[PDB]
Each structure stands twice: as C-alpha cells, then as structure tokens.
Design a protein around this ligand. Structure first.
Ligand SMILES: CCCCCCCCCCCC(=O)N[C@H]1CCOC1=O
Ligand SMILES: CCCCCCCCCCCC(=O)N[C@H]1CCOC1=O
Lengths: 233, 234
C-alpha cells in the first residue's frame, strides 16, 4: 500500500488519474482497465463517467451503443457490493455485446464495486485477454485491489463530484434535514407541523430553503436527492 | 486464514453461527469484545438497527434502554464516513456520560469497519479491548484481513437478516411499475407522467398503487423512497 496514499493526493486531473490506474493494471498482471462512477441522480437518466484503456474502437462502440445500459458488469456491479471474477465466454445473454468484447481481448475480468460519499457508486475493472484468474491469484491480490479501489473511489470522487453531482456541496440545517425526512415518507406540510408542533408556514419555509440549495423544483425531487446524497442519515 | 472462512461462511444459516464465528475472529485477533450489525434503511424517520455483541449484559440493556445508537460516535462515524475508524474511548470529549459508562465496561480500544451492502443496508464490525492501544504496526499487520472479512460478514449477515429487517428487499417490480416510480422520484404528477409516457392517468395510478402495496407503503413518495433505497430503481 506504500506510496499510493502519497500519489493519490498529488493527483489533480483525470490524466493523472488515468495514469495511476494504468500502472496499477500493469503492475498487477492485466492488459486493460476501466474505472468509473455512476452519478446517483437524476434517476430517469443515470449518467456514467468512466475512464478506460480498452481498444479505441471498442470505446466508441461502447459509447455509441450506450452499452452501460446492457453491460452485465455495470448492471450487476450496481446491485452487488463485493468483487466479481468474470469470463466473457460464460455469458449467454447479450452474446453480441460479449462477442465483440471478446473480439477485443476483453475476456478475463476482475471487477470491484465500491459505494462512496455522495451516492457515487464506483467500479474498478481489470481485464486481460488470456490466462484464467487463479484462485491463488485472488488471495494474493484481493486485499490490495479492494483497498486501492476504495482509495481511487475517494480521489475520483474528490475530482469529479463537484461537476458530476453538483449538490454534493449542499449542507442542510437540522430543521431542514427533518422536514425532508418526513417528506420522504410522504407527510404533508400540515402533518409535519402537527408532528413537530410548528406552523405549516414554517415547514414550507424550511423545505423551500432546502429545495433551492438542492436545485430542485418540487420537494419530492429535493427529498430524493437529499437521501441519495446521504444528507438524510 | 481467509480460505477456511469463505467455506465456513458459505454454510452459515443461523445468527448463533454468525455470533460464534465473529466471537472467534475477536479472540484470534486480540480483542476482548466485538459488535457486528446493520442499519435498515427504513423507516427514514426512525430507522432500526440490528446488531450482535458480547459486551457486558449490563451494557447491552443500557445501550438499548438509552437508545445509544443515536449518539454513539462510532455508529455516527460509520453512517457519515465510508472509512474505518480506530478509536480510544478516553479521547472523546463529546457525549461524556456515554463514554464514562462504556469505559466502565472496558469498551476502550476499538477498531470499526463500515461497509455498504445490498438493499441500502449499512453494516459495521467493531473489535474492542480494555487495554493496549491499537498501534500503527498492528494496524498494518491486520488491516487487510479485517476489511476483507467485513465485506464477507455483511454479505452473510445481509443474507441472513434481510428478509426480516428489510422485508421489502424480496419485492420484484414490473417494468412499468419501476418507471412510474422513477418519474415519481423527481416529483412528476400522474398527469405529467401520463403525458410523458402518453398513457392515461389512471393507468399511471394503477402501477403506483400496486407498487405501494408490494412495498407496503401508504403513499407514492414513501414507496418511491423505499424502492430507491432497496435498489429497484437503477
Ligand atoms: C457498477 C458501479 C458503477 C460504476 C460505473 C463505471 C463505468 C464502467 C464502464 C465499463 C465497465 C467495463 O469494463 N465493462 C466490460 C464488460 C465487457 O466489456 C467491457 O467493456
Ligand atoms: C454503520 C453504522 C450502522 C451500523 C449498525 C451497527 C450497530 C452496532 C452498535 C454498537 C457499536 C459499538 O460497538 N459501539 C461501541 C463504541 C462505544 O461503546 C460501544 O458500544
């Protein structure tokens, strides 16, 4: 783990970030990497920011085809919170996606999902075109890959969050925080005032402050953001 | 060593199995006490904790009767920070009465790993002893395994206790149900959702009412928050 904390603090661009993960990739016996985060909202159109060194033709195909929508590594890494070893030849769904992925050497993968601050979900994926991932290779590397990815997640977070989730800077008062907690379970302004023995006018006022902080147009949208960011906790 | 464990874990089916397996890691890594637990994501307003420990029973009842999950800074660290915490009770100047009582029971030198898991669960392993501070060489010696085993314990603990502490986690939602809840998550009205999908208000409302039941919620906001927190909207 030595030196990595030092390099992750001197990183200021994605090009420096890209270079770090590339060396982690090579120093650990793999051909390709991808690293990215899903921004937690808007929920209707979820936006991914990732880097990779895959063949450039695969990168354009992957982007044009919107292959995050179908990629089982992405679709499963959103619901499983633990590392996953994969082999592209094992998948019988999306066989077209996997055929041209295998065509590019994207065959034996190791994917490490982490949840981080601000509702970011990040994944490190290390891939190579040949040589199965040993069971002995797992124990030798699993602890460091797990550890480095939770460091990368933080740096990739610190780097991109103020743009890829702007509301990451929002801080709510205690009063604001409670208004949104009750608005989360669907309470009206009046029900909250009753519960907390304050006026409906005051309840509005606090929710309206928090909506604006959260660049939201109604309180149901603001509420879902505050939860997703971790502001309700 | 960790290979023995993935087998022991792939076969656990009871909380007493879990309890004794975590009691064994505590002793084999030099600690007097342990706690492992998870925070259910619902209800947001008063979310429930389910944990195990071997603390003095005088401390277990006291932690519950006083509702200490709400001021315990070790818990509060795990919810807000995604990093592990090495702690020494006597260092804390806030919530003094809490720490006097806990230091009275020898819950003094601790190491707490928080991990996020399925269904919006948040879990934490803590190991404690009454003496010998946790020094930076001991950290390096045992850090890798502790973070590793915590991610393993939470999977198994979530497997075990999810049906009870978040019973909505088994809910499956229709394609249509999923997307009426995604549009409700930004506060669109039934009519607004209708015009977006070019369907009738009442068919929007039917999907929402059916998801509300499945999610055991009494309004579409509560159900959307539950669906979101569990992972059904992704
Ligand atoms: C699940 C956690 C969310 C993190 C988002 C990261 C975005 C990463 C996109 C690329 C992932 C990735 O490398 N997919 C592989 C599968 C076969 O060919 C590929 O290209
Ligand atoms: C990640 C946050 C939620 C996880 C829920 C875990 C519940 C465990 C509660 C007990 C934690 C715990 O052991 N706290 C120590 C610190 C002072 O004396 C104590 O009792």
């Amino acid at each position: 783990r030595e030196g990595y904390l030092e390099i992750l603090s001197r990183i200021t661009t994605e090009e420096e970030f890209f270079s770090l993960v590339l060396e982690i990739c090579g120093n650990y016996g793999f051909e390709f990497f991808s690293f990215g985060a899903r921004a937690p909202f808007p929920l209707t159109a979820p936006k991914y920011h990732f880097l990779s060194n895959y063949p450039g033709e695969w990168k354009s195909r992957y982007i044009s085809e919107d292959y995050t929508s179908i990629d089982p590594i992405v679709r499963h890494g959103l619901l499983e919170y633990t590392p996953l070893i994969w082999n592209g030849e094992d998948f019988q769904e999306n066989r077209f996606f996997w055929e041209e992925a295998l065509h590019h050497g994207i065959r034996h993968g190791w994917s490490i999902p982490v949840r981080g601050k601000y509702g970011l979900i990040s994944m490190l994926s290390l891939v190579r075109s040949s040589e199965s991932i040993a069971a002995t290779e797992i124990l030798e590397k699993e602890s460091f890959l797990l550890w480095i990815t939770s460091m990368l997640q933080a740096t990739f977070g610190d780097l991109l969050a103020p743009r890829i989730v702007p509301e990451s800077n929002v801080r709510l008062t205690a009063r604001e925080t409670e208004m949104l907690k009750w608005t989360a379970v669907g309470k009206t302004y009046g029900e909250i005032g009753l519960i907390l023995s304050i006026d409906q006018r005051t309840v509005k006022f606090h929710i309206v402050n928090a909506m604006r902080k959260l660049n939201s147009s109604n309180k149901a949208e603001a509420t879902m953001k505050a939860y997703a960011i971790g502001l309700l906790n």
